[PDB]
Amino acid sequence: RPEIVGPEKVQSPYPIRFEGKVVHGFGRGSKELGIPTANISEDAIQELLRYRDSGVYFGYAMVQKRVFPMVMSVGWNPYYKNKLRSAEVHLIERQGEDFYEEIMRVIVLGYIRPELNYAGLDKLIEDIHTDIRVALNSMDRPSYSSYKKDPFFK
Ligand SMILES: Nc1ncnc2c1ncn2[C@@H]1O[C@H](COP(=O)(O)OP(=O)(O)O)[C@@H](O)[C@H]1O
Ligand SMILES: [Zn+2]
């Protein structure tokens, strides 16, 4: 896997800006895996991501008045046969308490990869760590890092 992805400069459809309240997930908490993920209110992403590819994206997100680089998994609610979009965000290198019910503002800047066939916990953790490394490397480029101060995070 490459250690950096996407064009040198942010390109359409990015940036994708949206906000939603953080809600509880579907059970199996990533907290135990050392990589907590914030589930975004379903009503904030159904149409917005309906035609976006499933997989891992990267960008910046703000919650509790703090901005962080992030990775986000876009998939489907595992409890319904009818396609219902789901989006879970991991705020990179964040330290703090939980933030359920808080509004999270998200700015997606690029795509990392599609869903990978589950190959075990070890492999999953490795893939997530790589996703994080890739996100940070990709956002170290000026066109991307400038979004950490986007007006949307005012
Ligand atoms: N860096 C972080 N990124 C995302 N969520 C975090 C982070 N730190 C703490 N959290 C908290 O972790 C929660 C998710 O924990 P988790 O074990 O995965 O339960 P759930 O299955 O409901 O998502 C989030 O809803 C958020 O309140
Ligand atoms: Zn979660």
Structural class: alpha+beta
In the CATH hierarchy, what is the superfamily?
Answer: Riboflavin kinase-like
Order of helices and strands: EEEEEEHH
Q: Helix segment count?
A: 2
CATH hierarchy, class: Mainly Beta
- Proportion in β-strands: 25-35%
Number of strands: 6
Q: Which term fits the overall shape?
A: globular
Largest sheet: 6 strands, antiparallel, barrel
Order of strands in the sheet with the most strands? 1-2-5-4-3-6
Radius of gyration: 15 Å
Number of domains as seen in the coordinates: 1
Helix content: 10-25%
Bound molecules: adenosine-5'-diphosphate, zinc ion
As for the CATH topology, it is Elongation Factor Tu (Ef-tu), domain 3
Per CATH, the architecture is: Beta Barrel
What can you tell me about this protein's structure?
It is a single chain. A 6-stranded antiparallel barrel has the order 1-2-5-4-3-6. The protein has helices at 121-139, 142-145; strands spanning 16-23, 38-40, 55-63, 66-76, 85-91, 103-113. The protein is an alpha+beta fold and 154 residues long. It has a single domain (1-154), classed as Riboflavin kinase-like (Elongation Factor Tu (Ef-tu), domain 3, Beta Barrel), CATH 2.40.30. 29% of the residues are buried. Strand 3 (55-63) and strand 4 (66-76) form a beta hairpin. The N and C termini lie far apart (35 Å).
